[PDB]
Amino acid sequence: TYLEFIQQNEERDGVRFSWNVWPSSRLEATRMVVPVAALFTPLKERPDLPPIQYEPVLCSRTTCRAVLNPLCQVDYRAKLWACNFCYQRNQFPPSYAGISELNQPAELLPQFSSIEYVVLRGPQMPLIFLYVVDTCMEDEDLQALKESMQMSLSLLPPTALVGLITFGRMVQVHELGCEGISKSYVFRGTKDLSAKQLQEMLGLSKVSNRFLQPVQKIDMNLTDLLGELQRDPWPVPQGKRPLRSSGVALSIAVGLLECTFPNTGARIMMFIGGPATQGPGMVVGDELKTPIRSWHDIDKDNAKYVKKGTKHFEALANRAATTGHVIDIYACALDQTGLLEMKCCPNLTGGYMVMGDSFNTSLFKQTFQRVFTKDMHGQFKMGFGGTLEIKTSREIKISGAIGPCVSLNSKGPCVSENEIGTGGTCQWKICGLSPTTTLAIYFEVVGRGAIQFVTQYQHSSGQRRIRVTTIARNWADAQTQIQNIAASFDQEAAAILMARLAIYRAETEEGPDVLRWLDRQLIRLCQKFGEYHKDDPSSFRFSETFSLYPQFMFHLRRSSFLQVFNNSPDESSYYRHHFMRQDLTQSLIMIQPILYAYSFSGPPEPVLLDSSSILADRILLMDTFFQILIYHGETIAQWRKSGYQDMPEYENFRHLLQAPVDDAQEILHSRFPMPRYIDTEHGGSQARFLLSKVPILTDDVSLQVFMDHLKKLAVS
Amino acid sequence: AMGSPIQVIENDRASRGGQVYATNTRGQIPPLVTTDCMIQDQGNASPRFIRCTTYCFPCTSDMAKQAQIPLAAVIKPFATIPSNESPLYLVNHGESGPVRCNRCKAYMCPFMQFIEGGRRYQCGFCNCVNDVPPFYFQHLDHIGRRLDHYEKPELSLGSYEYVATLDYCRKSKPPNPPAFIFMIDVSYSNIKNGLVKLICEELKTMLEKIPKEEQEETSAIRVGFITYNKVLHFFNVKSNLAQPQMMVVTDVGEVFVPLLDGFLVNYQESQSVIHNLLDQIPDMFADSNENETVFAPVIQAGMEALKAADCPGKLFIFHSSLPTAEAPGKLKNRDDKKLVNTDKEKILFQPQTNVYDSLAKDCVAHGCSVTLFLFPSQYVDVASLGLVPQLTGGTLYKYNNFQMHLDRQQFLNDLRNDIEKKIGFDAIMRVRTSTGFRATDFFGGILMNNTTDVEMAAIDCDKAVTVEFKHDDKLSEDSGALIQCAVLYTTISGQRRLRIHNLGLNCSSQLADLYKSCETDALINFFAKSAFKAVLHQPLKVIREILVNQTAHMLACYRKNCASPSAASQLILPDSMKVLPVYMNCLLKNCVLLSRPEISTDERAYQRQLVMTMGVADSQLFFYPQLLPIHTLDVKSTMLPAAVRCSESRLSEEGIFLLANGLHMFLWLGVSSPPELIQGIFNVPSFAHINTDMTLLPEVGNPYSQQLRMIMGIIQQKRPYSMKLTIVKQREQPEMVFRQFLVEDKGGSSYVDFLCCVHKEICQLLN
Ligand SMILES: [Zn+2]
Ligand SMILES: [Zn+2]
């Protein structure tokens, strides 16, 4: 089965391709409509593979430098191998002498296409956890956040470095371990700094400090400090927003690590409790009369602070990315905080983004806690300063990538002239990685072809490791093997691979020319791969290898990802931030929510996302990645409104009332950004969240109608 | 053969000493400052508050232009009224406010004539009639004595205070109480000489003594603390902390204060915190290897803080070395040889930058007064450092080459003394005058932005201001001339108050009367300041010329106009001006108007500044130093040994003398000094034994030493600046410097060389 193939090469190599058989000629590739592209996870959970504690072998040709893989031809006698990619002949190292066709090294084994190595870089660096804390909030929220930090501090490795910058009207860089007198360096909340200046001013050297000190040494002092943290002193006149200098504070954060610990694992964790109200990076004014940026506002050109303040955080992000550091953002308030403007920082570095109603909520306390999830070995599922390198056979070149990364602008023979996404390069730096971190890479044609994914990173243990994945896919004569090509199509993977293409386009200058672009391809895709007789729409049929793809497009075009009008510019940024990060499974659920039905009449079941599945004798559990929703049909509601479940007779109505809520719980634990929960029923003011998840090609319409205009457009 | 200063002092001491001088007569001539009599008010303000260069003005612009006597008044408003004399009364005219002339706006005083049955009055100053307000109305009596004229102190006294109503207050809200900000230079210099810990340790002690009015239970003055070394460290000392927090500001160049609340706090509430802070500051910076520092950003900050608390205040800055660290306010180490006839010598007495002058402006603007305790060890450019305190109405204490085993006591007293000083804040003074003249010039620790209102951020019992008058129109020999000196200020209890001094002087068309009514000490005081302010605008040769040409012109006018026919070989002086040629010479002999060899610019600028402030009491002594003989000292029962002239020609090799000018106090020993004394006084047998260097008060012996100590005590007693003691071996030792205070000697020209020089230009003009 082709399905068994896909599921196997994903779990083994972290890879999911839009096509698994590739057109051998640039042109019939262009008319395949969906590009040859891959959903790649560089650090996909791999407990089975055993790390090899030795250096990899790199092909001796300079432009190539590929890693030794199973696809290479080896002559064990004579100790020689040739690069598959460049065909260069290479000798083996000394220690390899006893290389035996039976006793052959790990990475030549077909099982080891994906493998990890242990470098001996030399410096063994600690982890660096810079807390940047906002102090403009209620003592409710600031106490709760204080508590959330004190425990985070307990979970850290003993060798770890921590620091504490606090802010408000002004920015405070605390001096830690300075016992008996607490001293802190204060800066105007209104004037931006250069790191160099910050290095001079904090009285620092060049390239443990008084600012960042080991947790096992500074635990009593810091935790004590945090416990003693109180809210921004300066009072807030009536009808006014506080003076919050979100912008400068971060700039000082990024600086402080730029000039003490450049190029090493660090995570700037900024917690904000409101919008920036005093620039740079200012997001809104300091009088409440003027509500914050709204999509409509921002569209009618009535949001003055979006262009200016965005270009600020956009510079910080790339400043943070240049030095290998992560910027998390943790935003909790009853209104917006400017995630739209600060989105680049989580986005370009490997940062986390968390959004909530307040810090004093389960939603946050739990979300924050997870971020320090440990593996079996007691180390974080984190990775830092990864560097991704992709090599391709000659026929293939790279357009670019879309995901959490930054271009190193390494030119190479593997670099295509026509670039997509982050392009014109064959190396990206991924500042923060998680076993979930997933990039879209976009290839371009110009016997098998091969692509090698090499990822060096900083494992949480501080061990510098390298991971290599080499995958191959077959070439096909498109004038002969069209079926062999159309057979290899990943409707699931191609769909996501399009989504990000579409969504990344909706950040660049293009207007609603995307619903347009996204349908033109969907119609093309039908035309090339659909079975029909001209003009017999009723005629149209799709292979089981394609039949789901237009239902995906229907759901994608009507989602919160593209229809951003009904959301806060911060929401929309937060949805998009998680989607571009995600592997295929999650990515899929986001775009098309999983719905389950619970009835007396049989076990729980996946049902269609149609109104037709909403029944009054049925309980529904909708599972958008972001939110978990439980729906009681009209009849089961009244049964629950009448108290029957409690009675000992109706044991079975007790259990149907529990089974969704049981599953709701599981999902509320394994998922990292804990999902909002909803308990609603027929007529619930919150039933709307369900009914809503259930020329342009069409005006918004029903699924069946959607297909109709498509069919009749395909066949013409 | 001339009447010596000391003959003149002692003469008037004999004639008027220990007698009550009551000011009830217009244009009376008060005793000289050098006479300890008793004063009773009764009409015209005490001469402890105000003295004039003449107590009889000329009545025509020409007549004044003829005699070239400067008309001027030395005013020392907050002067300490002595224990056996009457305190000021606090008058209160209710919601309306103090009564005033409608036209000149003069305050109700004794010079107000009541007419028409007490319904109306006519101002003395402008001859305008005002309506007596209903609440204040009263019945004239026989002659309009306005029965109650002896009961209400605004009607019968020269000096009293008014209670100030809200329209006398910034923003028409009752002013806040002030605060002291304590600012320590904690660089390497000052951690080494042991100074920082001195300052922190003593202070713990001192703060207690901050003043409070008698009507309140605790001082309302708040206190704050900052320490800087090219970067500024602020401290939080709020009532609720067991530990004080520090917040460093590194962005000098755009300084700011990092906090509100915790910076200025009631000392008593936050006592324990503050001691814990003051315990730690010395240690805190113990391994400071810093060298450069910043100055202006410190004043800047202090001012910004008192702005933020919305209160006037006083900055107590302790600083060591030339501020060289790059910040606005940097002073380069530049001194130049541009100072004899250069005409640019004026550049040396000016600040280097344009930031000090404006900054001074910012402070006064917000009622901030800065005081500077400076501990130099090299050129420090006092011209610039001391600019702000001078304009801001504060003080400059300067301790050269300070060493802890000597000047520890000098310093500790001055800090004690400056703290406990009676003070006033955010004051503005203006000096009203009767029809016929106006105050056209001022000289003091002051800052003026128009031509009428003398602004003084702070004012203390010690600072004085000389006010120069010219002629508008004409003065009548019936009216005389009037002055009403009035000072708006804010007390340490946060009340707006109005101190008022009224003086009445005679006027005359007969040139004789002019010279009969002059005071030398006051005239010297005006000349000195008038000259010293000119240093900043004109060449010192031009300055001195103007001074001599106006000395001779004075005596030449009195020669050819009130001099009974006497031979042309004589120099005829009036009696008020016996000693004026002598003193005038000494002013010109003083380094501020003289030359570089052996004096720094710093010593010159320091002297230039100190004087401006001076009272008449202080300007007397500074130019004509007191020289006491101690070998001939009586064992018991006498107040002091009489004074002797200031010349090496009164010194005995068998002798022991004491010379003081108000800042230095020398003890001088003849080579042949009588070893009996050398043992009681110093407890060492031999002149050979004693060390100039070990200048520390001497512990023991009771026959003398104690006699000596007390008199030195008698000497210190009324001076603001405790005086650096300097022991002097008689020959081949330093005395070279001591010599400089022997002022009737040559050293420019001597007394008998200038008395010769003036008689040449006196005869240059003839008839
Ligand atoms: Zn190669
Ligand atoms: Zn008047």
Domain closes at, from B402, B421, B440:
B421
CATH number (domain holding residue B530): 1.20.120.730
* Residue B109 domain-assigned (yes or no): yes
Q: Which positions 161-200 of B are in contact with A (Cβ < 8 Å)? A: none
Nearest CA in chain B to A199: B250
Tokens of A441: 């890479």
Residues B55 and B29: beta-carbon distance below 8 Å: yes
Domains in chain A, CATH or no CATH each: 1-52+114-124+382-476 (2.60.40.1670), 53-113 (2.30.30.380), 125-381 (3.40.50.410), 477-591+701-716 (1.20.120.730), 592-700 (3.40.20.10)
Q: Does B251 touch chain A if contact means CB atoms closer than 8 Å?
A: yes
CATH number (domain holding residue B664): 3.40.20.10
Tokens of A684: 């619930």
Please report how many Cα atoms fall inside a 13 Å half-sphere around the Cα of residue A399, on the Cβ side.
Answer: 17
- Separation between Cα atoms, residue A165 and residue A134, nearest integer Å: 9
Using CB atoms, which residue from A170, A183, A233 is nearest to B261? Answer: A233
- Amino acid sitting at position B189: S
Residues A614 and A631: beta-carbon distance below 8 Å: yes
* Residue B27 domain-assigned (yes or no): no
- For residue B100, the CA-to-ligand 2 centroid distance in Å is 7
Shared domain check, B372 and B313: yes
Question: Chain centroid to CA A251: how far?
Answer: 24
* Residue B24 domain-assigned (yes or no): no
Question: Chain centroid to CA B483: how far?
Answer: 21
* Residue B703 domain-assigned (yes or no): yes
Residues B36 and B18: beta-carbon distance below 8 Å: yes
- Separation between Cα atoms, residue A672 and residue A328, nearest integer Å: 14
- Amino acid sitting at position A229: L
Residues of B in contact with A180 (CB under 8 A): 243, 280
Shared domain check, B706 and B680: yes
- CA separation, residue B588 to residues A193, A478, B494, B759 (Å): 56, 112, 44, 17
Discontinuities in chain B (C→N > 2.5 Å), after residue: 747
- Residue B316's SS3 state is strand
Shared domain check, B353 and B314: yes
* Residue B26 domain-assigned (yes or no): no
- For residue B287, the enclosing domain spans 177-421
* Residue B25 domain-assigned (yes or no): no
| Contact at CB, B248 and A172, closer than 8 angstroms | no
Residues A336 and A567: beta-carbon distance below 8 Å: no
Q: Is B596 exposed, middle or buried (0-12, 13-18, 19+ CB in 10 A)?
A: middle
Q: Does A184 touch chain B if contact means CB atoms closer than 8 Å?
A: yes
Q: Does B254 touch chain A if contact means CB atoms closer than 8 Å?
A: yes
Tokens of B151: 């009961």
- Separation between Cα atoms, residue B578 and residue B706, nearest integer Å: 37
DSSP string, B20-46: EEE--STT--PPPTT---EEE-SSS--
Q: Which residues contact A235 (CB under 8 A, 6 or more apart)?
A: none
> By what method was this entry solved?
X-ray
CATH number (domain holding residue B250): 3.40.50.410
Nearest CA in chain A to B261: A233
Of A550, A559, A619, residue with least CA distance to A592 = A559
Residues B111 and B101: beta-carbon distance below 8 Å: no
Domain closes at, from B125, B157, B189:
B157
Domain closes at, from B475, B507, B539:
B507
Q: Does A181 touch chain B if contact means CB atoms closer than 8 Å?
A: yes
Beta strands at A182-188 and B50-52: parallel, antiparallel or unpaired:
unpaired
What was the resolution (in A) of this experimentally determined structure? Answer: 3.4
- Separation between Cα atoms, residue A320 and residue A267, nearest integer Å: 10
CB pairs under 8 A between A and B: 43
* Residue B739 domain-assigned (yes or no): yes
| Contact at CB, B246 and A172, closer than 8 angstroms | no
Using CB atoms, which residue from A181, A186, A202 is nearest to B258? Answer: A186
Shared domain check, B480 and B568: no
Q: Does B247 touch chain A if contact means CB atoms closer than 8 Å?
A: yes
Q: Which residues contact A263 (CB under 8 A, 6 or more apart)?
A: A323, A324, A385
Residues of A in contact with B243 (CB under 8 A): 180-182
Q: Does A234 touch chain B if contact means CB atoms closer than 8 Å?
A: yes
Looking at the complex, report in whole angstroms how far the Cα of residue A191 sits from the nearest Cα belonging to chain B: 10
Segments of A105-149 assigned E as strands: 114-118, 128-134
Shared domain check, B503 and B366: no
Give chain A's largest Cα–Cα span.
86
Residues B243 and A182: beta-carbon distance below 8 Å: yes
Shared domain check, B216 and B347: yes
Shared domain check, B487 and B557: no
Q: Does A552 touch chain B if contact means CB atoms closer than 8 Å?
A: no
Shared domain check, B264 and B242: yes
DSSP state of B86: P
Shared domain check, B764 and B653: no
Tokens of B393: 């109405």
Tokens of B551: 């000395």
| Contact at CB, A183 and B260, closer than 8 angstroms | no
Residues of A in contact with B249 (CB under 8 A): 186
For chain B, how are helix, strand and coil distributed in percent, rounded to 5?
30, 20, 50
CATH number (domain holding residue B69): 2.60.40.1670
SS3 track for B150-188: CCCHHHHCCEEEEECCHHHCHHHCCCCCCEEEEEEECCH
Tokens of A200: 């001079």
- CA separation, residue A354 to residues A212, B11, B207 (Å): 25, 93, 52
* Ramachandran sector of residue A78 (left: φ over 0; alpha: ψ -120 to 50; beta: rest): left
* Residue B517 domain-assigned (yes or no): yes
* Ramachandran sector of residue B407 (left: φ over 0; alpha: ψ -120 to 50; beta: rest): alpha
Residues B443 and B529: beta-carbon distance below 8 Å: yes
Q: Is the bond into A280 cis (omega within 30 degrees of 0)? A: yes
Shared domain check, B391 and B306: yes
On whether A83 is known to bind a ligand per the annotation, the reply is yes
Shared domain check, B328 and B216: yes
| Contact at CB, A186 and B284, closer than 8 angstroms | no
Shared domain check, B618 and B633: no
Using CB atoms, which residue from A172, A180, A187 is nearest to B251? Answer: A187
Of A80, A37, A29, residue with least CA distance to A57 = A80
CATH number (domain holding residue B120): 2.30.30.380
The number of folded domains in chain B is 5
On whether A59 is known to bind a ligand per the annotation, the reply is yes
